Each structure stands twice: as structure tokens, then as C-alpha cells.
């Protein structure tokens, strides 16, 4: 381990071995000094115009962190295509992480003149929250992950966290965490860091779409032996009185047939069209938003439980806050136009999951008698019911991979709503920080903590290797399947490539459900 | 032991084992040149307004020194709470000290 | 086992061993004759003012029963404090029950 | 272990073996039901006429306890005489305790007619506070110890204790103890109990008087080589001016001689004569009492540090609260007459310890000059000084044996002031209680704790055997020693024997210091 010796090589590749695929990606990173080496209490109350739904109390820290919770951090577009076009499923098995070729640079600023040089003896500090003692900030769809394109140099995100709050104030249970309290490895140029991790057992992601629907599992050609109430009143003319008539469900009465299952849970969202002219002329994104109520404040149930984005022929419709939406390259942070973002679609699950913008179904609302007509009620919120079956939200090339399951007494189907794998012991948080280097101190002793430091930052490479287990497709479907494919005809540029300006871009969201499977 | 190699890691932690608790803390320090590298006779007599109760004779040296004779140098607030809320007593047994990642 | 010999001692205590705590409590009890040694059908219908939400049918028996389904049956206030101030969790593992020094 | 079988024999004896003496005594006891089987908060504040110096907060318990912390519980008068007339010292080594021949009786009360019968199936509970977790109530000179006379049946004392208080109220640190929280042995008639204990290493008690005094250790016949300032002014007539004259201490100037030691510490007490006519005519027992000030309240330093009761020829004088005082048989509890009590005397220690009613000595009080005569100050309170030597208070046949040293960070010469051996781990407290036996309960369930119990009490024997180590006398004194002796001439009764009424009595206090020893 010396100044003149590399401490690691560039490992970027993918190998397919059978029921496994191993991805490996390396990137060059840059880490500045955050918070001026300080920890700062940050808060936001209800003063000014800040609403109560957005209050918070927490801290910003001088630390940065590595994040690769995004599929494109590991799969190239072509690899993603190889995965989704041929496998009914897949899942993470184990990973290796490495930090190397570290270099700490210090910048001198005198008379407009700026010079940067190495500080051969400075160190960075690194450690993993292997015992999950820090607030788990990963799994919240934050920016700062390794770039999709291998040639892009990225900046390391700053670590910050939240605790309990009451307005802009802290409460008795509010917790303060000092990351310097943890043992951490100190590396100088020449030193490297690495660790291994094994994923817990988790189900394969459903990278397939159903080629059958819950309400169409019977034999088209045979009647049931079971009967259903088919008539409640006579029909012979005008002397119509009450009676009781029963019939057997059959090919023409599939909606009446007795069935064994029920569609998945529902939490109805407001519908909105991509054809603005068809929408009400008001600003309802928030006022008509589907939300949950937690201790006084409201949050969008975004994207909320997995529901079909729209029913047959209505591609223009989508749940106001019930789908993942990515931005196109350079889309504005605020009020970006529809043509600057990319809406995803969980259309593939219409097959088992209720459509996100409609009722779950209908229930009786009273007791009918001869003097009281029967009444019905529309169900727009339907929790788990015995016999329900459903699918989870799909995952995307540019979407999240996993999330830490909250440590609670209970929960229900812990599949992270934004999509992905829910893990009790997810990949550990990897914290990194440039060690503060005092600028000359006074010549006579003083109690005060130093606050004058040499200006510096660090850079180096990072590698992440993940082994994935594949669940091969075993279909007897005779006719060809749907497959993700590149466009055929000429185009100004190549999809999933760089610009004349060297800018890489992801033209569209790529899901995972192309192959089909029976129910 | 080289220019490009760290000579120690950051050890800051606490472990409770039964009738023992081990504290470990690391800090970053800075040391200036003191007394211009000199030893100086320093004194204070009874002239001016200086009272006799405060007279003294000694020396200032070009040296610095490490001091961790203060409980919070070892126990975090929470650890101190764990200690005082559950034990009738405690006492120091042994220690390890280390200086590393030195840069002039 | 004789008239003049105790058939058990008073065990009331608590011991903390690490990831375990063993509670032990003894009490003196009294048992009368219930229901005049009889089993009786007991019922409550919707007559008088008794609402339907409270109707019931069952039996009262000549038997008594032991119950210690209440944490204070095992933890003293101080022990409860030792438990809740230092542990993220706890749970029951096994138990021993004993009846002795019986006198009719 | 049966109803018809004794569970122990009567062991009362003494055997002398050399440097050891083993005492053994058995007594018959009776234990009633205390506090109606209840624990009760007891308090005493500053209301009515109750002074602040006497406030307190604590609890009375349903338990009784065994106490044998009194030498006459083990030594007969003759044995005590054998001990003190022949040994320079002695100390406790180990003990055995036993409870047996237990019988629980229940009393029926109907129409003035009272009958008592056995309750063959009832139990008593016994246990030792072997880990010193309960307030140590022994060592406070309380009544209730085994009787001096073997034939006397005694009643077991009730256990109660005190915690912190503020007036008649408790405070945050006040502790409540439940003795049923402790494991305890349950015995029916037929069962027995016993335990063993070993005394910690402790110095031999000084059962001797010094035949030399601190200020008379030199050779009567030789001068010192050392000099002392003997003259400060000339003497030749009236032209007397200052000068400096020095001399050598010698046989006629022993008070001036240089010496190596200093008399023991001092805490001056007010003197009082047994000839009432010589005392001031006022009620000064409390107002002139020697006391210590602890958190707002005052206590008599009684008897306080060990000091000689009186100097030569003043047997009639004694410290108002600086000596142990026992009562004669049947002396009233309150305002007993002088002729009804027995004052002890620590006269034997005049030899090293200051007299309790005089100064420790004299010190300079200023800086003398030619224009300022020297001044002196009388010292009435003198704490430990390098070079001091002293003796402890003597112990008495009817006095206490040991006391538990308070659990504190520090202390000084932990010899219990009332006299005896100070132990960090003294004999454990032995608690005993009759188990409550419900009288018939109601026939239909009720939440309330039972409060109706069968009336009963218990009785049985108790044995205590203690082994004492003796320090034999090794004197070369030619002439006979002083010895405790029975009176020679006729008397109405025999000292240390019973009455025509069968009442045993101890005519006088018997100390321990008869043999002599050089310094
Ligand atoms: Na493409
Ligand atoms: Na006598």
C-alpha cells in the first residue's frame, strides 16, 4: 500500500452463468467537505407559509454515504433487456463492495489564483452501519446513487436524518446521533476498503405478466353444478310479483359464476388524463390527492398500494399519485412539463389488482323488504379479505431495488410500495467522510474547538458486485411473447447512449413484465 | 509505516460485558509550536496589585500534553446514564493509549 | 409428607443473569366452598331491563382456579423499573408452579 | 421430623479449652402476631409538641427478630469473671444458631371463656438477611435480646425500620422493604432451622487497664539530652528583662520533658456530680448536652468518643451523656432515680484518653511581641493528631457485643462508640414470623385482601453457640493484680441470683479491665 501503487482495478462487467448473473460496476466519485465539518440541528416549523404537513426536526452531518439502490447502477440497458426478456423472476443473493485509489486534494486560494494539490498524508474515514444503529436513509428514492453511465463522475450525497418533532421543536424522545461515535477505517492514498454482504431469503420478483384474469379461470365450455339466485320477480307481463329463480353459471354468465378468489386490496386514487382538456379546470393535485393521516399531518399515499394504472383502452388515464414518475434528462426540478417526465404504468396487473381509479366493488347497504327496495354502497377503500390475491408494483431499470422493512411489531406484505425487495437486514449504509485537517492553530492555548481548516476534498473509485439468482421461464405458450425491443427505424440519436454533447440519457422507463404466466 | 499508509483507525465505542464496560474514544488534535521552542522562567510577585496569596515561580515549556481526566472523555451521555442508573459503583481497571495518523 | 412437616418453603425473589431474569413469588391463599359444592346453570335473558347485548348462558362450578396473568404477580416495582429502563424487549420462557403447606 | 418428636435438645454450657472458650445458651421464646399481620407506615413530625430533632419516617412490620448482641446472652456471671480475671483480651470467632421444638398455638375466645390449643399444621417463617439487604436494626442497644437468666421465657421483639424523612413526610429516596420478598424457610411443629457464621478478623478487645500513663514513660533517674525553653526573662531583682534560658528535662521536670506521643482525641462533655447539691440548679441535661448536628437535627453524642469518666479522686463526677448507664431490676422507664440505675465508668483509661469533662490542652492564640503579652486558648474539641494513642470504651457483661460498620466511603477507627466490635459483615439479622392463617372467607368471591385471621402465636427454643478466642496474659508484674470478686460478708440475697419472688437481677455493671499491662 503505497503512494505510487494503485489499490484496485476497474471492474465493470456482467457474466451470465445459468440461474445466476453477476453484475459488476465501478465509478469515480468526489466527496467535498460537508457542513464545514459540523453537525447541525435543522428544523422546519409552521411559521411563514410552511404547512404543518411538512414540519420536521433532525440533523445534517459532515458525512457522505454510498448508494447503489437503483437497478441501473448494476445493469446496463442491454443486460436489463437480457434479464426481462427471458426470466420469470430474479433476486439479489450477495454483494461485494470496494473503495480504492483514494486521493485527497487540498485547494489553496490566494488572489483570485486557485491551485489544487495532493495532500499525501490526509485520510478519509469509512464504515458500515452493520448493526443498523443509524437512521436508515437509503430506500427513500434519493438522488446521489452511482450513475447509470460508467463514464460519469458523481458527487457523494450528504448524510442527514430526522427524529421526532412537534412543529419545529424536538421532543423528549428525539434522538441525536454522532457518526464519529462508531469505529471507522481510516485510509490514506494507498489504503483501500471492502466488505461482503449476503442478502436474506426473499421471493423472486415477478418479472412477468399474467395471461389470465382472476374472473376468467373457468372452463369456457362447461356449466357449473352450483346455482346462483338468478331471478327475484316474475316476468310474464304486468302481474309481476316476487318469486325465486335459480340458475347455473355457464359460458354466457361468467360474471355470475361462483369463484374461489377476490381481487387484491384497494385504496382509490383520483384519475387524471394526459389530455389536459379532459381534466377539471382547478388545481387538485393536493386537494384531491389520496393521502394517509399520521399524528396530525397528511402525506400522499405515493404511489401507495399496487393497483392497475388504467383499464382497457385508457392509456391516457393515471392515478394522480399512484405511479412512479421519472424525469427525462434535464427535466426541471419544479413544475416540469408533462413532456419532460416519463410516467410508468402498472397496467400489467389489471389481471388481479383493482384499477387504481375505480371502486373495489359493491356491497349491500341495507335490509330489503317488500316495502323497502335494496340499496347498495360503492367500496373505494378495501383492506385485506380472505381469498384475495394480488401482484406487487413492478421494478424499473431506473427504479429502486430494496428498502429496509421498518422495525415494528407487525406489518402486512412488506414489499416496499415504491417497488422492490423488502429486507429486514438490507445492505448496510456505507458512510464516508474526509477527516478534518486543522489549519495552523494559535500559538497560545485556547479552549475553543478549532474552526479553521485546510480546504480539501477527496476522490477515488468505488466497486459494487452483486450476484443475482434467476428463475428461468418454463412456458408452454405456443405463440411468441411480448418483448422489450429497440426501435427499428432511423433516429437522430441512439436510445440509451450519449449526446453530441456527451450527455447520457434514459429515453424511457423500462419495466420487467414481458413474458407471461398463467394464474 | 509509510507516507501513504494510515497508522491507525478510528476507534470510538463502548461495550458492556457484565461486571465490565469498556469505553473507547478517538479525537483529532492540533499541536502548535509553544514558547517559540523555548523554556521560559515565569514568575509573579507582590508588585503592582498582585497579592501575596498569588505569588509563584516556575517555567513554561515548549511541550504539550495529553489529558483525558474527565469522565465525558470516555462516556457518552447515554452511556453515563446506563452506568449511573444501574450500578452501585464502578472503577478504572486498565487503559490503552495511542497516537497515530500524524501529519506535520 | 406428614402433619407436622412443611411441604415447601417461601420462595420470593428475583435474579438477573444476563439475557435472563428469573422471578419467583409466593403468596398465601384461601379457598372457600363455592356454589355449595354444586354446579349451577346460570343465565341472563332479555326480560326486565336486561338488554340483548348482555344475554348469556353458562354454568358456575364448585371449583376455584389460580391466576397469575398480571405482571405485578411476578415483578416488584423496582424490578419492573430495572426491566423497562434497560431492555428493548423481553418474553416468557418457562415456569414452575407449586401448591404446598395445605391446611383444611 | 414429626409431631411427636423433639427437633432439638437444650444446649446450655461453657467449655474452656486453652486459647478458646465456647459458650452455648438456649432459651424458650414466644412470638405473637405483630401489626395484625400488616405493614404500617409510621411517622412522627413537628406537630403538637414533637421537636424537629425527633422527626422520623419508617415502617413497622409483621415480623419479629432474634437478638443476642449482649454479652450476658452467652456468659454467665461466673464465666464472665473467669474471662476478665485471666485474659488480656478476647474476641468472637464463629457461631451456630438453631430454632427448634416449635409449636404454634391458636386461641379461641367465646363468652369470656378463653381456650388455647395446638394448630399442628400451622407454620412460622424464618430467614437470615445474609446479604445485608434490610436495614440493620441490631446494634442500637434495643431490648428483646435473649435473657441473662436461662430459665426466663422471653418475648420476641418486633422488627421495624427507618428511612429518610422531611418532617413527618417521606422523600424521593425513602425506601420501603417487604420481608415477604425474601426466600424464607417455613417450619411446622417438627421442623427446625439452623445456620453457621464466621466472624471476620477483628482485634482482641482490651480487657486490661494500663499500669502506666502516657506522660510517665521515661526513666525516673536520667536526664534527657534534649533541652527545652525554660526561661524567658531574667530573675536577679527588679531590672528584669527578656532573655533566653534552656534546660534539660529530668526527674523533677517530667511535665517539661520531650515526649513521643499525645493523648487520644477529645469532645468535652459537661460534668455532673452524683451529689445533687453540687450541681447547678437548672434542667441542663439537654441544653448543656454534648451533641452532633446532622441535617437540621441534633443528637446527643451519647456516649460519644471514649474518654475517662473522671480524674483522680472524683468518682462522684461523670459526663452528662458520656457513659453507659444500665437500670437496676425494675427501674422505671422514665425519670428513674439515681438509686435505680447503675453508672459505668471508663476511669481505667485516664491513662491515655483525656478526661471527658475537661480540656484536651492549651494552644497559642496570638503572636507575642515586646508590646503584646502571649495569649492562650483552651481546646475542648480535638480531632485526630499525629502521635495520638487511645483506648476504646470497655464492654460490659450486660453491654452490647458488636455493631455493623456503616457502609460508607470512609470512617475513622470503626469501633462502635457504645462499645464492642465493629464488623463489616456482622452476624446476620434473623427474622421470624407466624404465617397468617385465614379465618373462614366469604362464600362468594371478593377482590379485597382477607383481614379476618385465626388468632395464634408461637413458641419454641433457640440456641446460640459462640466460640471465642482468648489472648492469655503474659505479665511479669510481681505484686497481685486487681480482680473482680464477690462480696465476702453476709447479705440478704446472693448477687446475680434470683429473688424470693424468682426474679433474676444484675446488681452491678461488670467491666472487663482488671489485669494490667504496660504501655
Ligand atoms: Na432501446
Ligand atoms: Na458478685
From TrEMBL, chains A, D:
Location(s) in or outside the cell: Virion
**Residues engaged in binding AMP:** 415, 422
Its cellular-component GO annotations read: T=1 icosahedral viral capsid
* Keywords for the protein's UniProt record, in alphabetical order: Capsid protein, Nucleotide-binding, T=1 icosahedral capsid protein, Virion
Q: What is its main location?
A: virion
Q: Name one GO molecular function term.
A: nucleotide binding
Chain ranges of the Coat protein VP1/VP2 Parvovirus domain: 1-491
Similarity comment: family membership: Belongs to the parvoviridae capsid protein family.
Name listed for the protein in its UniProt record: Capsid protein
This chain's source organism reads: Adeno-associated virus 8
Taxon lineage: Viruses, Monodnaviria, Shotokuvirae, Cossaviricota, Quintoviricetes
Q: Which residues of the whole protein are included?
A: 220 to 738 of 738
Amino acid at each position: 500500500d503505497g503512494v505510487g501503487s494503485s489499490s484496485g482495478n476497474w471492474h465493470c462487467d456482467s457474466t451470465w452463468l445459468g440461474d445466476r448473473v453477476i453484475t459488476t460496476s465501478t465509478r469515480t466519485w468526489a466527496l467535498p467537505t460537508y457542513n464545514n465539518h459540523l453537525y447541525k440541528q435543522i428544523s422546519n416549523g409552521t411559521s411563514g407559509g410552511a404547512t404543518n404537513d411538512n414540519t420536521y426536526f433532525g440533523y445534517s452531518t459532515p458525512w457522505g454515504y454510498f448508494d447503489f439502490n437503483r437497478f441501473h447502477c448494476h445493469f446496463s440497458p442491454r443486460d436489463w433487456q437480457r434479464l426481462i426478456n427471458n426470466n420469470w423472476g430474479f433476486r439479489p443473493k450477495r454483494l461485494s463492495f470496494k473503495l480504492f485509489n483514494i486521493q485527497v486534494k487540498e485547494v489553496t486560494q490566494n488572489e483570485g489564483t486557485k491551485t489544487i494539490a495532493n495532500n499525501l498524508t490526509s485520510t478519509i474515514q469509512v464504515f458500515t452501519d452493520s448493526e443498523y444503529q443509524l437512521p436508515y436513509v437509503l430506500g427513500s428514492a434519493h438522488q446521489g446513487c452511482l450513475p447509470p453511465f460508467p463514464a460519469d463522475v458523481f458527487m457523494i450525497p450528504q448524510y442527514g436524518y430526522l427524529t421526532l418533532n412537534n412543529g419545529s421543536q424536538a421532543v423528549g424522545r428525539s434522538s441525536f446521533y454522532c457518526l464519529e461515535y462508531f469505529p471507522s477505517q481510516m485510509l490514506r492514498t494507498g489504503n483501500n476498503f471492502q466488505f461482503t454482504y449476503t442478502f436474506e431469503d426473499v421471493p423472486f420478483h415477478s418479472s412477468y405478466a399474467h395471461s389470465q384474469s382472476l374472473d376468467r379461470l373457468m372452463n369456457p365450455l362447461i356449466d357449473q353444478y352450483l346455482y346462483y339466485l338468478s331471478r327475484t320477480q316474475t316476468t310474464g307481463g304486468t302481474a309481476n310479483t316476487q318469486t325465486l329463480g335459480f340458475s347455473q353459471g355457464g359460458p354466457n354468465t361468467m360474471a355470475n359464476q361462483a369463484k374461489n378468489w377476490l381481487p387484491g386490496p384497494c385504496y382509490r386514487q383520483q384519475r387524471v388524463s394526459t389530455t389536459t382538456g379532459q381534466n377539471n379546470n382547478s388545481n387538485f393535485a393536493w386537494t384531491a390527492g389520496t393521502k394517509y393521516h399520521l399524528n396530525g399531518r397528511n402525506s400522499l399515499a405515493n404511489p401507495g398500494i399496487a393497483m392497475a394504472t388504467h383499464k382497457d383502452d385508457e392509456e391516457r388515464f393515471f392515478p394522480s399519485n399512484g405511479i412512479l414518475i421519472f424525469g427525462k434528462q434535464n427535466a426541471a426540478r419544479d413544475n416540469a412539463d408533462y413532456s419532460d417526465v416519463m410516467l410508468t404504468s402498472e397496467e400489467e396487473i389489471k389481471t388481479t389488482n383493482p384499477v387504481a381509479t375505480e371502486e373495489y366493488g359493491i356491497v349491500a347497504d341495507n335490509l330489503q323488504q317488500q316495502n323497502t327496495a335494496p340499496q347498495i354502497g360503492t367500496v373505494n377503500s378495501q383492506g385485506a379479505l380472505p381469498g384475495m390475491v394480488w401482484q406487487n408494483r413492478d421494478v424499473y431499470l431506473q427504479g429502486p431495488i430494496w428498502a429496509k422493512i421498518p422495525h415494528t411489531d407487525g406489518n402486512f406484505h412488506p414489499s416496499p410500495l415504491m417497488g422492490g425487495f423488502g429486507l429486514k437486514h438490507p445492505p448496510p449504509q456505507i458512510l464516508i467522510k474526509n477527516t478534518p485537517v486543522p489549519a495552523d492553530p494559535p500559538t497560545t492555548f485556547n479552549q475553543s474547538k478549532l474552526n479553521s481548516f485546510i480546504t480539501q476534498y477527496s476522490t477515488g473509485q468505488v466497486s459494487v458486485e452483486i450476484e443475482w439468482e434467476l428463475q428461468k421461464e418454463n412456458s408452454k405458450r405456443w405463440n411468441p411473447e411480448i418483448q422489450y425491443t429497440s426501435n427499428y427505424y432511423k433516429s437522430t440519436s441512439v436510445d440509451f447512449a450519449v449526446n453530441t454533447e456527451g450527455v447520457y440519457s434514459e429515453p424511457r422507463p423500462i419495466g420487467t413484465r414481458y413474458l407471461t404466466r398463467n394464474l
